[PDB]
Amino acid sequence: QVLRIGGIFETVENEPVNVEELAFKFAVTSINRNRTLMPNTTLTYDIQRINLFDSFEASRRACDQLALGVAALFGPSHSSSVSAVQSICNALEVPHIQTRWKHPSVDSRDLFYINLYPDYAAISRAVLDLVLYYNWKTVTVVYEDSTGLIRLQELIKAPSRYNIKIKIRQLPPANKDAKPLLKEMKKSKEFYVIFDCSHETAAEILKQILFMGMMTEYYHYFFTTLDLFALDLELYRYSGVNMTGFRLLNIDNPHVSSIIEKWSMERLQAPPRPETGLLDGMMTTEAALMYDAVYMVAIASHRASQLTVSSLQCHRHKPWRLGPRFMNLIKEARWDGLTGRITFNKTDGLRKDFDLDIISLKEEWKKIGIWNSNSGLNMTDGNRDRSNNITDSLANRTLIVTTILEEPYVMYRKSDKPLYGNDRFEGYCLDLLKELSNILGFLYDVKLVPDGKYGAQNDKGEWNG
Amino acid sequence: ACDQLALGVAALFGPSHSSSVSAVQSICNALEVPHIQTRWKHPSVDSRDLFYINLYPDYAAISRAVLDLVLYYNWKTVTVVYEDSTGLIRLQELIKAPSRYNIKIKIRQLPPANKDAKPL
Protein backbone atom coordinates (compact mmCIF):
# COMPACT_ATOMS: atom_id res chain seq x y z
CA GLN A 1 0.00 0.00 0.00
CA VAL A 2 0.95 3.68 -0.36
CA LEU A 3 0.54 6.80 1.77
CA ARG A 4 -1.17 10.06 0.81
CA ILE A 5 0.13 13.41 2.06
CA GLY A 6 -1.32 16.76 0.99
CA GLY A 7 0.32 20.18 1.00
CA ILE A 8 -0.87 23.66 -0.03
CA PHE A 9 1.43 26.69 -0.12
CA GLU A 10 0.36 30.33 -0.57
CA THR A 11 3.11 32.37 -2.23
CA VAL A 12 3.46 35.04 -4.90
CA GLU A 13 3.82 33.49 -8.35
CA ASN A 14 5.43 36.37 -10.26
CA GLU A 15 8.97 35.18 -9.46
CA PRO A 16 10.39 31.63 -9.34
CA VAL A 17 8.56 29.63 -6.70
CA ASN A 18 9.56 28.86 -3.11
CA VAL A 19 12.36 26.35 -2.57
CA GLU A 20 10.78 24.40 0.30
CA GLU A 21 8.58 22.69 -2.29
CA LEU A 22 11.79 21.36 -3.83
CA ALA A 23 13.11 20.42 -0.38
CA PHE A 24 9.88 18.53 0.36
CA LYS A 25 10.19 16.66 -2.94
CA PHE A 26 13.83 15.84 -2.16
CA ALA A 27 12.89 14.53 1.29
CA VAL A 28 10.07 12.34 0.00
CA THR A 29 12.27 10.98 -2.80
CA SER A 30 15.07 10.22 -0.33
CA ILE A 31 12.76 8.33 2.03
CA ASN A 32 11.37 6.48 -0.99
CA ARG A 33 14.92 5.38 -1.83
CA ASN A 34 15.69 4.10 1.67
CA ARG A 35 13.92 0.86 2.61
CA THR A 36 15.54 0.74 6.06
CA LEU A 37 12.58 2.77 7.37
CA MET A 38 9.59 0.96 5.82
CA PRO A 39 9.91 -1.57 2.98
CA ASN A 40 6.30 -2.42 2.08
CA THR A 41 5.00 1.16 1.74
CA THR A 42 6.13 4.18 -0.30
CA LEU A 43 5.06 7.79 0.23
CA THR A 44 2.87 9.39 -2.44
CA TYR A 45 1.69 12.98 -2.61
CA ASP A 46 -0.35 15.46 -4.61
CA ILE A 47 1.15 18.95 -4.71
CA GLN A 48 -1.14 21.94 -5.21
CA ARG A 49 0.03 25.47 -6.02
CA ILE A 50 -2.21 28.48 -5.37
CA ASN A 51 -1.77 32.24 -5.29
CA LEU A 52 -1.39 33.76 -1.83
CA PHE A 53 -4.19 35.55 0.04
CA ASP A 54 -7.87 34.82 -0.70
CA SER A 55 -8.40 32.23 2.02
CA PHE A 56 -11.68 31.32 0.31
CA GLU A 57 -9.64 29.63 -2.42
CA ALA A 58 -7.67 27.90 0.34
CA SER A 59 -10.97 26.58 1.70
CA ARG A 60 -11.88 25.34 -1.78
CA ARG A 61 -8.54 23.53 -2.05
CA ALA A 62 -9.07 22.06 1.42
CA CYS A 63 -12.44 20.69 0.29
CA ASP A 64 -10.83 19.26 -2.85
CA GLN A 65 -8.07 17.58 -0.83
CA LEU A 66 -10.41 16.12 1.80
CA ALA A 67 -12.48 14.75 -1.08
CA LEU A 68 -9.44 12.51 -1.55
CA GLY A 69 -8.25 12.44 2.06
CA VAL A 70 -4.74 12.40 3.53
CA ALA A 71 -3.10 11.96 6.93
CA ALA A 72 -1.69 15.48 7.36
CA LEU A 73 -1.76 18.90 5.72
CA PHE A 74 1.10 21.32 5.03
CA GLY A 75 0.44 25.05 4.91
CA PRO A 76 -0.94 27.56 4.25
CA SER A 77 1.87 30.00 5.09
CA HIS A 78 -0.38 32.93 6.08
CA SER A 79 -2.17 33.39 9.40
CA SER A 80 -5.47 34.22 7.69
CA SER A 81 -6.04 30.79 6.14
CA VAL A 82 -4.58 28.68 8.95
CA SER A 83 -7.31 29.78 11.38
CA ALA A 84 -10.05 28.24 9.23
CA VAL A 85 -7.79 25.31 8.35
CA GLN A 86 -7.26 24.44 12.01
CA SER A 87 -10.95 24.99 12.73
CA ILE A 88 -12.00 22.49 10.05
CA CYS A 89 -9.22 20.08 11.05
CA ASN A 90 -10.50 20.13 14.63
CA ALA A 91 -14.04 19.66 13.28
CA LEU A 92 -12.96 16.55 11.33
CA GLU A 93 -10.35 15.44 13.94
CA VAL A 94 -7.53 15.69 11.38
CA PRO A 95 -4.13 16.52 12.94
CA HIS A 96 -2.35 19.37 11.16
CA ILE A 97 1.40 19.97 10.80
CA GLN A 98 2.79 23.46 10.18
CA THR A 99 6.34 24.63 9.51
CA ARG A 100 6.07 28.30 10.47
CA TRP A 101 5.22 30.27 13.60
CA LYS A 102 1.78 31.81 13.96
CA HIS A 103 0.09 33.80 16.70
CA PRO A 104 -0.50 31.35 19.57
CA SER A 105 -4.04 30.31 20.46
CA VAL A 106 -4.11 31.18 24.17
CA ASP A 107 -7.91 31.44 24.27
CA SER A 108 -8.09 27.70 23.55
CA ARG A 109 -5.22 25.44 22.52
CA ASP A 110 -6.11 23.20 19.58
CA LEU A 111 -5.28 19.53 20.11
CA PHE A 112 -4.37 19.20 16.43
CA TYR A 113 -1.95 22.10 15.83
CA ILE A 114 1.72 21.03 15.80
CA ASN A 115 4.56 23.46 15.04
CA LEU A 116 8.33 22.90 14.98
CA TYR A 117 10.17 26.21 15.50
CA PRO A 118 11.77 27.73 18.63
CA ASP A 119 9.52 30.06 20.61
CA TYR A 120 9.88 33.82 20.82
CA ALA A 121 10.05 33.68 24.61
CA ALA A 122 12.64 30.93 24.09
CA ILE A 123 14.88 33.37 22.22
CA SER A 124 13.97 35.88 24.92
CA ARG A 125 15.38 33.95 27.88
CA ALA A 126 18.27 32.70 25.75
CA VAL A 127 19.33 36.28 25.02
CA LEU A 128 18.65 37.13 28.67
CA ASP A 129 21.19 34.46 29.61
CA LEU A 130 23.78 35.65 27.10
CA VAL A 131 23.49 39.33 28.06
CA LEU A 132 23.72 38.42 31.75
CA TYR A 133 26.88 36.47 30.92
CA TYR A 134 28.31 39.61 29.29
CA ASN A 135 27.31 41.67 32.38
CA TRP A 136 26.23 44.85 30.57
CA LYS A 137 23.95 47.34 32.34
CA THR A 138 23.22 49.55 29.30
CA VAL A 139 22.01 48.07 26.00
CA THR A 140 19.92 49.30 23.07
CA VAL A 141 17.46 47.04 21.24
CA VAL A 142 15.53 47.85 18.06
CA TYR A 143 12.86 45.97 16.10
CA GLU A 144 10.75 46.61 13.01
CA ASP A 145 7.42 44.92 13.79
CA SER A 146 4.92 44.56 16.62
CA THR A 147 5.87 40.88 16.88
CA GLY A 148 9.47 41.77 17.80
CA LEU A 149 8.39 42.62 21.32
CA ILE A 150 7.05 39.06 21.44
CA ARG A 151 10.68 38.00 20.93
CA LEU A 152 12.11 40.49 23.46
CA GLN A 153 9.38 40.59 26.13
CA GLU A 154 11.55 39.15 28.89
CA LEU A 155 14.24 41.67 28.02
CA ILE A 156 11.48 44.20 28.64
CA LYS A 157 10.86 42.62 32.05
CA ALA A 158 14.60 42.62 32.82
CA PRO A 159 14.57 46.08 34.54
CA SER A 160 11.68 44.93 36.75
CA ARG A 161 14.13 42.74 38.70
CA TYR A 162 17.57 43.98 37.56
CA ASN A 163 19.49 47.25 37.28
CA ILE A 164 19.45 47.05 33.47
CA LYS A 165 18.40 50.15 31.55
CA ILE A 166 16.91 49.64 28.09
CA LYS A 167 16.90 51.92 25.04
CA ILE A 168 14.25 50.47 22.72
CA ARG A 169 13.92 51.70 19.13
CA GLN A 170 11.50 50.85 16.32
CA LEU A 171 12.06 50.46 12.57
CA PRO A 172 9.22 51.81 10.40
CA PRO A 173 8.37 49.66 7.36
CA ALA A 174 10.76 49.94 4.37
CA ASN A 175 14.57 49.88 4.46
CA LYS A 176 14.92 53.64 3.87
CA ASP A 177 13.76 54.53 7.40
CA ALA A 178 16.93 53.34 9.17
CA LYS A 179 18.91 56.33 7.86
CA PRO A 180 17.44 58.84 10.38
CA LEU A 181 17.72 56.39 13.26
CA LEU A 182 21.39 55.66 12.62
CA LYS A 183 22.02 59.40 12.55
CA GLU A 184 20.45 59.69 16.01
CA MET A 185 22.70 56.77 16.97
CA LYS A 186 25.55 59.06 15.92
CA LYS A 187 24.07 61.85 18.05
CA SER A 188 23.68 59.70 21.18
CA LYS A 189 26.74 57.61 22.01
CA GLU A 190 25.90 53.93 22.42
CA PHE A 191 28.02 50.90 21.56
CA TYR A 192 25.72 48.04 22.71
CA VAL A 193 23.03 47.54 20.07
CA ILE A 194 20.76 44.58 19.31
CA PHE A 195 18.93 44.17 15.99
CA ASP A 196 15.73 42.16 16.48
CA CYS A 197 14.62 41.56 12.90
CA SER A 198 14.12 38.88 10.28
CA HIS A 199 17.18 37.57 8.46
CA GLU A 200 15.90 38.93 5.13
CA THR A 201 16.57 42.46 6.40
CA ALA A 202 19.94 41.74 8.03
CA ALA A 203 21.86 41.53 4.75
CA GLU A 204 21.03 45.04 3.59
CA ILE A 205 21.18 46.36 7.17
CA LEU A 206 24.80 45.20 7.36
CA LYS A 207 25.45 46.53 3.85
CA GLN A 208 24.10 49.96 4.81
CA ILE A 209 25.99 50.17 8.09
CA LEU A 210 29.28 49.15 6.47
CA PHE A 211 28.53 51.78 3.82
CA MET A 212 28.55 54.23 6.71
CA GLY A 213 31.19 52.07 8.40
CA MET A 214 29.96 51.89 12.00
CA MET A 215 31.40 48.39 12.56
CA THR A 216 34.55 49.03 14.58
CA GLU A 217 36.09 47.27 17.55
CA TYR A 218 34.34 49.91 19.67
CA TYR A 219 30.99 48.27 18.90
CA HIS A 220 29.56 44.88 19.88
CA TYR A 221 26.88 43.58 17.51
CA PHE A 222 24.34 40.81 18.14
CA PHE A 223 21.37 39.71 16.05
CA THR A 224 18.27 37.76 17.06
CA THR A 225 18.58 35.79 13.81
CA LEU A 226 19.22 32.11 14.44
CA ASP A 227 21.55 31.62 11.44
CA LEU A 228 24.67 33.65 10.70
CA PHE A 229 26.02 31.44 7.90
CA ALA A 230 23.06 32.05 5.58
CA LEU A 231 23.56 35.82 5.83
CA ASP A 232 25.88 37.58 3.41
CA LEU A 233 29.49 36.93 4.43
CA GLU A 234 31.55 40.03 3.68
CA LEU A 235 32.83 40.34 7.26
CA TYR A 236 36.57 39.74 6.88
CA ARG A 237 37.51 43.03 8.50
CA TYR A 238 41.08 43.72 9.55
CA SER A 239 39.71 46.71 11.49
CA GLY A 240 38.20 44.55 14.24
CA VAL A 241 34.48 43.78 14.42
CA ASN A 242 32.49 42.11 17.20
CA MET A 243 29.82 39.92 15.58
CA THR A 244 27.73 37.47 17.60
CA GLY A 245 24.67 35.35 16.92
CA PHE A 246 22.95 32.00 17.26
CA ARG A 247 23.36 28.75 15.35
CA LEU A 248 20.90 25.85 15.16
CA LEU A 249 21.88 23.98 11.98
CA ASN A 250 24.19 21.09 12.85
CA ILE A 251 27.40 20.89 10.80
CA ASP A 252 29.27 17.98 12.42
CA ASN A 253 28.20 14.31 12.22
CA PRO A 254 29.44 13.95 8.61
CA HIS A 255 26.14 12.31 7.65
CA VAL A 256 24.55 15.70 8.30
CA SER A 257 27.29 17.19 6.13
CA SER A 258 26.57 14.72 3.32
CA ILE A 259 22.96 15.92 3.52
CA ILE A 260 23.90 19.60 3.42
CA GLU A 261 26.33 19.33 0.48
CA LYS A 262 23.99 17.03 -1.46
CA TRP A 263 21.45 19.82 -1.08
CA SER A 264 24.13 22.33 -2.09
CA MET A 265 25.03 20.39 -5.24
CA GLU A 266 21.39 19.83 -6.20
CA ARG A 267 20.74 23.57 -5.84
CA LEU A 268 23.56 24.59 -8.19
CA GLN A 269 22.71 22.12 -10.96
CA ALA A 270 19.69 24.37 -11.66
CA PRO A 271 20.05 27.72 -13.48
CA PRO A 272 21.12 30.52 -11.12
CA ARG A 273 18.47 32.32 -9.06
CA PRO A 274 18.80 36.07 -8.44
CA GLU A 275 18.93 36.96 -4.76
CA THR A 276 18.84 39.99 -2.46
CA GLY A 277 22.30 39.24 -1.03
CA LEU A 278 21.69 36.01 0.86
CA LEU A 279 24.11 33.27 -0.18
CA ASP A 280 22.34 30.55 -2.17
CA GLY A 281 23.40 26.95 -1.61
CA MET A 282 23.33 26.62 2.18
CA MET A 283 20.47 25.49 4.40
CA THR A 284 17.75 27.84 5.62
CA THR A 285 15.97 27.28 8.92
CA GLU A 286 12.43 26.95 7.53
CA ALA A 287 13.34 24.31 4.95
CA ALA A 288 15.48 22.38 7.45
CA LEU A 289 12.66 22.22 10.00
CA MET A 290 10.26 21.28 7.20
CA TYR A 291 12.65 18.44 6.34
CA ASP A 292 12.54 17.38 9.99
CA ALA A 293 8.73 17.58 9.81
CA VAL A 294 8.72 15.29 6.76
CA TYR A 295 10.75 12.84 8.82
CA MET A 296 8.21 13.34 11.63
CA VAL A 297 5.56 12.22 9.14
CA ALA A 298 7.71 9.20 8.26
CA ILE A 299 8.33 8.14 11.88
CA ALA A 300 4.62 8.53 12.57
CA SER A 301 3.91 6.47 9.45
CA HIS A 302 6.00 3.35 10.06
CA ARG A 303 4.06 2.47 13.24
CA ALA A 304 0.63 3.27 11.77
CA SER A 305 -1.49 0.67 10.00
CA GLN A 306 -2.48 0.64 6.33
CA LEU A 307 -4.01 3.85 5.03
CA THR A 308 -7.77 3.92 4.43
CA VAL A 309 -8.99 6.47 1.90
CA SER A 310 -12.05 8.43 3.00
CA SER A 311 -14.58 10.64 1.20
CA LEU A 312 -15.86 13.56 3.27
CA GLN A 313 -17.31 17.05 2.93
CA CYS A 314 -15.83 20.26 4.30
CA HIS A 315 -19.40 21.20 5.28
CA ARG A 316 -19.90 17.90 7.12
CA HIS A 317 -19.05 17.21 10.75
CA LYS A 318 -18.69 13.43 10.92
CA PRO A 319 -15.26 12.54 12.39
CA TRP A 320 -12.93 10.12 10.65
CA ARG A 321 -11.68 7.25 12.75
CA LEU A 322 -7.91 7.23 12.34
CA GLY A 323 -7.28 10.92 13.03
CA PRO A 324 -7.20 10.46 16.81
CA ARG A 325 -4.79 7.51 16.60
CA PHE A 326 -2.31 9.31 14.36
CA MET A 327 -2.61 12.39 16.59
CA ASN A 328 -1.87 10.36 19.72
CA LEU A 329 1.06 8.50 18.16
CA ILE A 330 2.54 11.73 16.76
CA LYS A 331 2.24 13.23 20.25
CA GLU A 332 5.02 10.84 21.34
CA ALA A 333 7.17 11.30 18.22
CA ARG A 334 10.87 11.51 19.06
CA TRP A 335 13.79 11.88 16.66
CA ASP A 336 17.01 13.84 16.05
CA GLY A 337 16.84 16.43 13.28
CA LEU A 338 18.80 19.08 11.43
CA THR A 339 17.72 21.51 14.15
CA GLY A 340 18.85 18.89 16.67
CA ARG A 341 16.79 17.11 19.32
CA ILE A 342 12.99 17.18 18.86
CA THR A 343 10.42 16.40 21.53
CA PHE A 344 6.98 17.70 22.46
CA ASN A 345 5.60 18.55 25.89
CA LYS A 346 2.54 16.60 26.99
CA THR A 347 0.42 19.78 27.12
CA ASP A 348 0.97 21.29 23.65
CA GLY A 349 2.17 20.55 20.12
CA LEU A 350 4.80 23.28 20.24
CA ARG A 351 8.37 22.10 19.84
CA LYS A 352 10.52 21.83 22.97
CA ASP A 353 14.08 21.04 24.17
CA PHE A 354 15.61 23.61 21.85
CA ASP A 355 19.24 23.85 20.80
CA LEU A 356 20.86 27.30 20.64
CA ASP A 357 24.61 27.47 19.97
CA ILE A 358 26.17 30.94 20.20
CA ILE A 359 28.67 31.65 17.42
CA SER A 360 31.03 34.62 17.10
CA LEU A 361 33.32 36.01 14.40
CA LYS A 362 37.07 35.97 15.01
CA GLU A 363 38.42 34.36 11.80
CA GLU A 364 38.54 37.51 9.67
CA TRP A 365 33.57 29.64 13.94
CA LYS A 366 34.56 29.04 17.58
CA LYS A 367 32.72 27.23 20.35
CA ILE A 368 31.77 29.20 23.47
CA GLY A 369 28.63 27.72 25.01
CA ILE A 370 25.21 26.21 24.43
CA TRP A 371 21.75 26.70 25.86
CA ASN A 372 19.16 23.98 26.44
CA SER A 373 15.65 24.00 27.88
CA ASN A 374 16.25 21.46 30.66
CA SER A 375 19.05 23.55 32.20
CA GLY A 376 20.52 27.05 31.99
CA LEU A 377 23.34 28.51 29.92
CA ASN A 378 25.76 25.59 29.61
CA MET A 379 29.19 27.22 29.33
CA THR A 380 30.94 24.43 27.44
CA ASP A 381 34.12 26.20 26.33
CA GLY A 382 36.15 28.39 28.66
CA ASN A 383 38.05 29.85 25.67
CA ARG A 384 41.81 29.63 25.09
CA ASP A 385 42.27 33.39 25.72
CA ARG A 386 45.13 34.24 23.38
CA SER A 387 47.52 37.10 24.11
CA ASN A 388 50.02 38.25 21.49
CA ASN A 389 53.43 39.88 21.74
CA ILE A 390 52.31 42.51 19.20
CA THR A 391 48.60 43.31 19.43
CA ASP A 392 47.39 44.69 16.11
CA SER A 393 45.23 43.41 13.27
CA LEU A 394 47.83 43.71 10.50
CA ALA A 395 47.90 47.53 10.84
CA ASN A 396 45.03 48.30 8.46
CA ARG A 397 43.68 51.49 10.05
CA THR A 398 44.67 55.13 9.60
CA LEU A 399 44.92 56.60 13.10
CA ILE A 400 43.23 59.98 13.53
CA VAL A 401 45.65 62.29 15.35
CA THR A 402 44.87 65.89 16.26
CA THR A 403 47.70 68.25 17.19
CA ILE A 404 48.52 71.91 17.81
CA LEU A 405 51.55 74.09 17.11
CA GLU A 406 54.04 74.30 19.98
CA GLU A 407 57.83 74.38 20.10
CA PRO A 408 59.65 71.97 20.05
CA TYR A 409 56.83 69.48 19.68
CA VAL A 410 55.38 70.69 16.35
CA MET A 411 56.73 73.07 13.72
CA TYR A 412 56.88 73.46 9.95
CA ARG A 413 60.04 72.13 8.34
CA LYS A 414 62.59 74.67 7.12
CA SER A 415 62.05 74.69 3.35
CA ASP A 416 61.13 77.06 0.53
CA LYS A 417 58.92 74.59 -1.35
CA PRO A 418 55.17 73.98 -0.93
CA LEU A 419 54.36 71.37 1.70
CA TYR A 420 52.12 68.34 1.22
CA GLY A 421 51.08 65.06 2.84
CA ASN A 422 51.76 64.01 6.42
CA ASP A 423 55.32 65.35 6.48
CA ARG A 424 54.64 69.09 6.48
CA PHE A 425 55.88 69.14 10.09
CA GLU A 426 58.50 67.74 12.43
CA GLY A 427 59.03 67.47 16.16
CA TYR A 428 59.02 65.20 19.20
CA CYS A 429 55.43 64.11 18.55
CA LEU A 430 56.12 62.94 14.99
CA ASP A 431 59.04 60.97 16.39
CA LEU A 432 56.82 59.33 19.02
CA LEU A 433 54.54 58.35 16.15
CA LYS A 434 57.37 56.88 14.10
CA GLU A 435 58.79 54.62 16.83
CA LEU A 436 55.32 53.57 18.00
CA SER A 437 54.47 52.62 14.41
CA ASN A 438 57.75 50.71 14.04
CA ILE A 439 57.35 48.77 17.30
CA LEU A 440 53.56 48.37 16.95
CA GLY A 441 52.54 48.54 13.31
CA PHE A 442 49.77 51.04 12.60
CA LEU A 443 48.89 53.77 10.11
CA TYR A 444 48.10 57.43 10.76
CA ASP A 445 47.78 60.84 9.14
CA VAL A 446 48.10 64.31 10.65
CA LYS A 447 45.12 66.63 11.21
CA LEU A 448 45.15 70.17 12.56
CA VAL A 449 42.78 71.22 15.33
CA PRO A 450 40.01 73.48 13.97
CA ASP A 451 39.86 75.19 17.37
CA GLY A 452 43.47 76.01 18.23
CA LYS A 453 43.38 75.40 21.99
CA TYR A 454 43.84 72.65 24.55
CA GLY A 455 40.23 72.77 25.77
CA ALA A 456 38.44 74.21 28.78
CA GLN A 457 34.97 74.65 30.22
CA ASN A 458 32.78 77.69 29.57
CA ASP A 459 30.50 77.39 32.66
CA LYS A 460 27.89 75.78 30.37
CA GLY A 461 28.96 72.24 31.25
CA GLU A 462 30.36 71.73 27.74
CA TRP A 463 34.08 71.21 27.18
CA ASN A 464 36.01 72.67 24.28
CA GLY A 465 39.27 72.04 22.45
CA ALA B 1 -21.91 33.44 8.10
CA CYS B 2 -23.22 31.04 5.43
CA ASP B 3 -26.64 31.11 7.10
CA GLN B 4 -26.71 34.91 7.04
CA LEU B 5 -25.54 35.00 3.42
CA ALA B 6 -28.27 32.55 2.41
CA LEU B 7 -30.83 34.63 4.30
CA GLY B 8 -29.56 37.89 2.82
CA VAL B 9 -28.75 41.09 4.69
CA ALA B 10 -26.96 44.36 3.95
CA ALA B 11 -24.00 43.95 6.34
CA LEU B 12 -22.74 41.93 9.30
CA PHE B 13 -22.08 43.09 12.86
CA GLY B 14 -19.29 41.61 14.96
CA PRO B 15 -18.22 39.18 16.15
CA SER B 16 -16.55 40.57 19.27
CA HIS B 17 -13.52 38.26 19.07
CA SER B 18 -11.10 38.78 16.19
CA SER B 19 -10.44 35.04 15.84
CA SER B 20 -13.81 34.63 14.12
CA VAL B 21 -13.56 38.14 12.63
CA SER B 22 -10.72 36.97 10.39
CA ALA B 23 -12.91 34.26 8.86
CA VAL B 24 -15.89 36.63 8.66
CA GLN B 25 -13.70 39.02 6.67
CA SER B 26 -12.50 36.13 4.48
CA ILE B 27 -16.05 35.28 3.41
CA CYS B 28 -17.13 38.93 3.22
CA ASN B 29 -14.33 39.90 0.84
CA ALA B 30 -14.76 36.61 -1.03
CA LEU B 31 -17.82 38.25 -2.62
CA GLU B 32 -16.65 41.82 -1.78
CA VAL B 33 -19.42 42.80 0.65
CA PRO B 34 -18.80 45.50 3.30
CA HIS B 35 -18.43 44.35 6.91
CA ILE B 36 -18.06 46.54 10.00
CA GLN B 37 -15.85 45.56 12.94
CA THR B 38 -16.70 46.46 16.53
CA ARG B 39 -13.29 46.90 18.18
CA TRP B 40 -9.57 46.61 17.48
CA LYS B 41 -8.38 44.05 14.94
CA HIS B 42 -4.79 43.29 13.99
CA PRO B 43 -4.14 45.19 10.73
CA SER B 44 -3.32 43.27 7.57
CA VAL B 45 0.40 44.04 7.27
CA ASP B 46 1.02 41.92 4.16
CA SER B 47 -2.11 42.58 2.10
CA ARG B 48 -4.27 45.68 1.66
CA ASP B 49 -7.98 45.60 2.47
CA LEU B 50 -10.42 48.41 1.73
CA PHE B 51 -13.22 46.61 3.62
CA TYR B 52 -11.78 47.47 7.06
CA ILE B 53 -14.41 49.45 8.96
CA ASN B 54 -13.21 49.76 12.57
CA LEU B 55 -14.64 52.54 14.72
CA TYR B 56 -12.17 51.77 17.56
CA PRO B 57 -9.72 54.61 18.32
CA ASP B 58 -6.26 54.26 16.81
CA TYR B 59 -3.31 53.19 18.94
CA ALA B 60 -1.18 55.93 17.37
CA ALA B 61 -3.60 58.70 18.36
CA ILE B 62 -3.85 57.71 22.03
CA SER B 63 -0.09 57.10 22.16
CA ARG B 64 0.68 60.56 20.80
CA ALA B 65 -1.87 62.02 23.22
CA VAL B 66 -0.18 60.42 26.23
CA LEU B 67 3.29 61.42 25.07
CA ASP B 68 1.95 64.96 24.61
CA LEU B 69 0.64 65.04 28.18
CA VAL B 70 3.79 63.56 29.71
CA LEU B 71 5.93 66.08 27.82
CA TYR B 72 3.61 68.92 28.85
CA TYR B 73 3.84 68.07 32.54
CA ASN B 74 7.59 67.70 32.00
CA TRP B 75 8.37 64.88 34.42
CA LYS B 76 11.87 63.59 33.72
CA THR B 77 11.61 60.43 35.88
CA VAL B 78 8.58 58.21 35.20
CA THR B 79 7.70 54.51 35.20
CA VAL B 80 5.19 52.51 33.16
CA VAL B 81 3.48 49.16 33.81
CA TYR B 82 1.82 47.00 31.16
CA GLU B 83 -0.40 43.93 31.39
CA ASP B 84 1.52 41.82 28.85
CA SER B 85 3.70 42.16 25.77
CA THR B 86 0.42 42.68 23.90
CA GLY B 87 0.16 45.88 25.94
CA LEU B 88 3.20 47.58 24.39
CA ILE B 89 1.60 47.72 20.94
CA ARG B 90 -0.28 50.79 22.18
CA LEU B 91 2.72 52.66 23.61
CA GLN B 92 5.60 51.83 21.25
CA GLU B 93 6.71 55.45 20.99
CA LEU B 94 6.37 56.53 24.64
CA ILE B 95 9.47 54.43 25.33
CA LYS B 96 11.02 55.50 22.01
CA ALA B 97 10.77 59.13 23.18
CA PRO B 98 14.06 59.14 25.21
CA SER B 99 15.79 59.04 21.83
CA ARG B 100 14.92 62.71 21.25
CA TYR B 101 14.92 63.54 24.98
CA ASN B 102 16.34 62.22 28.26
CA ILE B 103 13.38 60.78 30.16
CA LYS B 104 14.47 58.14 32.67
CA ILE B 105 11.79 55.54 31.95
CA LYS B 106 11.21 52.44 34.09
CA ILE B 107 9.33 49.37 32.86
CA ARG B 108 7.55 46.53 34.67
CA GLN B 109 5.03 43.82 33.77
CA LEU B 110 1.79 42.53 35.30
CA PRO B 111 1.57 38.74 35.82
CA PRO B 112 -1.38 36.66 34.56
CA ALA B 113 -2.54 36.59 38.20
CA ASN B 114 -3.36 40.24 38.94
CA LYS B 115 -5.29 39.53 42.15
CA ASP B 116 -1.94 39.12 43.96
CA ALA B 117 0.08 41.93 42.38
CA LYS B 118 1.25 42.98 45.86
CA PRO B 119 4.93 42.02 45.22
CA LEU B 120 5.64 44.12 42.12
UniProtKB/TrEMBL annotation, chain A:
<dbReference type="GO" id="GO:0004970">
    <property type="term" value="F:glutamate-gated receptor activity"/>
</dbReference>
<comment type="similarity">
    <text>Belongs to the glutamate-gated ion channel (TC 1.A.10.1) family.</text>
</comment>
<keyword id="KW-1071">Ligand-gated ion channel</keyword>
<keyword id="KW-0597">Phosphoprotein</keyword>
<feature type="disulfide bond">
    <location>
        <begin position="63"/>
        <end position="314"/>
    </location>
</feature>
<keyword id="KW-0675">Receptor</keyword>
<dbReference type="GO" id="GO:0030425">
    <property type="term" value="C:dendrite"/>
</dbReference>
<keyword id="KW-0472">Membrane</keyword>
<dbReference type="GO" id="GO:0051967">
    <property type="term" value="P:negative regulation of synaptic transmission, glutamatergic"/>
</dbReference>
<dbReference type="GO" id="GO:0043195">
    <property type="term" value="C:terminal bouton"/>
</dbReference>
<keyword id="KW-0813">Transport</keyword>
<keyword id="KW-0406">Ion transport</keyword>
<keyword id="KW-0628">Postsynaptic cell membrane</keyword>
<dbReference type="GO" id="GO:0042391">
    <property type="term" value="P:regulation of membrane potential"/>
</dbReference>
<keyword id="KW-1015">Disulfide bond</keyword>
<keyword id="KW-0325">Glycoprotein</keyword>
<keyword id="KW-0812">Transmembrane</keyword>
<keyword id="KW-1003">Cell membrane</keyword>
<protein>
    <recommendedName>
        <fullName>Glutamate receptor</fullName>
    </recommendedName>
</protein>
<keyword id="KW-0770">Synapse</keyword>
<dbReference type="GO" id="GO:0045211">
    <property type="term" value="C:postsynaptic membrane"/>
</dbReference>
<keyword id="KW-0407">Ion channel</keyword>
Automatic annotation (TrEMBL), chain B:
<comment type="similarity">
    <text>Belongs to the glutamate-gated ion channel (TC 1.A.10.1) family.</text>
</comment>
<comment type="function">
    <text>Receptor for glutamate that functions as a ligand-gated ion channel in the central nervous system and plays an important role in excitatory synaptic transmission. L-glutamate acts as an excitatory neurotransmitter at many synapses in the central nervous system.</text>
</comment>
<protein>
    <recommendedName>
        <fullName>Glutamate receptor</fullName>
    </recommendedName>
</protein>
